[PDB]
Amino acid sequence: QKQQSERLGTEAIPKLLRSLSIPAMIGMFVMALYNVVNTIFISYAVGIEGVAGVTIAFPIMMIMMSMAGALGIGGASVISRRLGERRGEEANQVFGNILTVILVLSVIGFISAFTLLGPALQLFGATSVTQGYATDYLFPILLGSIFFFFAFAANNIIRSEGNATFAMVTMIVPAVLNILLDVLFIFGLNMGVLGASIATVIAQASVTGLVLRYFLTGKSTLSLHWSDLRMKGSVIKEVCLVGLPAFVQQSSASLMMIAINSMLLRFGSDFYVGVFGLVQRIMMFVMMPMMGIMQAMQPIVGYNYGAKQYSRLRETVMLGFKVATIFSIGIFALLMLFPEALLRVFTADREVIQAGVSAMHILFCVTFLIGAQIVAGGLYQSLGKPKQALILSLSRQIIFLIPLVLILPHIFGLSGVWWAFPIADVLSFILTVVLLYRDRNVFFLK
Template sequence: MKQKMQSERLGTEPIPKLLKSLSIPAMIGMFVMALYNVVDTIFISYGVGIDAVAGVTVAFPIMMIMMAVSAAMGIGGASVISRRLGERKEEEANHVFGNIISVILIISVLGIISSFTILEPILRLFGATPEILGYAFDYMFPILLGTFFFSFAFATNNIVRSEGNARFAMMTMIIPAVINIILDPIFIFGLNMGVRGAAIATVISQASVTLIILHYFLTGKSTLQLRLVDLKLKLTILKEVIAVGLPAFAQQAAGSVMMIAINTMLIRFGGDMHVGIFGIIQRIIMFTVMPMMGVMQGMQPIVGYNYGARNFERLRETVILGLKVTVFLSFLIFALVMAVPHWLMMIFTSDPEVIQAGSEYLRIMFSAVFLIGGQVIGSGLYQALGKPKQALILSLSRQLIFLIPLVLILPHFIGVYGVFLAFPISDFFACVLASILMYRDRDIFFKKGKNTTEETIPVSSGT
């Protein structure tokens, strides 16, 4: 009954109040997720230096690949499990859960093997110079040893959400963040472990929350049961999970490719310092984009519910309000970065040269940030409406179609500035693409009035 009332409010509660109540928890969750890398970067920058930040930045694509696989299993598995539970097929849901755990165990073994065999060659391939290779290796080695903790926590967070236990899912993000913040200064400064200390602190924080999640599943607090018999891999289950999780994997993997391209061009046309500066700016991007992503996530269930209920007036009101809020936030971010970029850089470093150069590059990268709101809302809308093709196009267009080619081309004409200038140009093109797609499907997004059940829901081409 409680779940029924919870879903019914999506069709009855005033849109502004509803969007606020759903967006703020999403923002908090994303804030906590972004906190890891930000805290690590601050302590590493002040405790070791900008070269160490560059080393971590070069190593980061490896983590992104690891998280891409975990995201695919977690998001895909959560979707399949929630549908099985809705069909009252608890045994099949447990089989799916067991298969996800098996894949995580396989990934973990590969991660450990990689740390002892191919880590250094991969880091060199990803652009690590002799000056920053040691920092990159020191950071990534403990992370790969702890692959199981990262993959398990990341994947099961989505599965816990699929059961409807949003509060526990949020706690599994908050707890490791707090532990990481406490341990970082102890290992980096107190024990003088430098970059490796930051990595070990992160692994311990993830190991801690892994134990909490295991306790949750093993003590009957979950609808699901973790049983040995369910660990046997079944091809039909894996196919279904991977099919649903593939867009999430593609987006994460594209981000990894983007990072490799950027780091390579920064080292070629600039130097290690430029990689470190980009690493800092990337953390700033995480926090500035986070509010808009929170609005998008809060908007999605409202859009999906009212689209299914054929209540197009509420859908239209939600889309317009979401666009207004994200556009306002994007202009606010633009004003902040243009006015005080040096203040943002000073959070991460006290090096005058890094602050001066970083402020200039920060302004360049954020010069078209006010265009991001439409992209974010457009991608979220198509996901909520069950149109994966358009959602995938919008999610990947900025990175794969526009940003990576520009990053690889522009530096040949204007040097290192080309890498940073590629961002606002790609924002412009991605905004144009989002506008074209949304205008084409405007009959869905902006239909006026509450429709009757006899009306036909318009279906765009390409779905």
């Protein structure tokens, strides 16, 4: 019991999602812009060498980010599950008693920066060139760790409450900055990776300075305390609880895409790593459309569970679903009528727009089904019972994906790329379907 500051708690619930989604739909899309408009520089004051440096260094970023993402997520499904179920002050506690574990790692990172940086880095396809870059990239980042962590937790929990809007602005803003911040060093100076890396710390600092405001200054949305608010609850236990499947999802994908970057450093030293980098943020970029919808419900389907209008949250979940789908099929179509013009950035041989696009062809006759497949995941999450969600990811990401590449690559070919995805994913979808007639309670409406 505290004071539920504006945002909502309202039951104006379709425009809830509507004007809870779009802020992700924007922020994300723009940080997706930054990603873009940043890298391309590093194809300039440096060529493609460091562009790999990054692409290898990359996963090691996500290593922490998964860790603070679990952290960030817990928060979001706790704090909403406790703002319908209105233990208002518990939230206050949580918030801070997370900031603990963060500041724990915001140090461990600092530590390993000075420690495990190289040790780990060198450990795979260490092209004497791209090596230094990744270091010169990674060294800053870890220093460095602190702002980074915070800002994602924060920009996650503020969704967990209601502020996808100021989220917008925890977002839009590093972006715009970073752009002009990089330009600054990378090009205008010549602090290449070396300093587009410090450009993006000065980014994640400058937000944090701001996030303190929207958490101290006119302590917006909610229960937000600062002196001894936190300590180290036995609540800690309770977010690692929510988060376990959260940091799995990444440390499933992340821990597997270091591999496919470095097994491809044994074949294509740098030519083929920059194009990994490339294929991602078109998955990711035109993931967003989905991704964003989910974070709407994240807290919506959060304080609605929380002993409130069970009635109207299914409304969320059916709608939730209902939308997604139309983007599932939307992307999917657009992802297989324009696999041509998107391989018109990949312009090379007339064989490149062949088995290059053959994978991209029916590799993704799956897409339209992916909608649910992921909606489901925030709705075992917006409702702290990720034990089934725990269950879930391990299918999609590992215990069905890997045990499919492997069973085509024993020997089945560049067919072992293709069938391995299309189909692994659909066993994952079929599976999910059953976890909801397992639980005729989320969607206890149709």
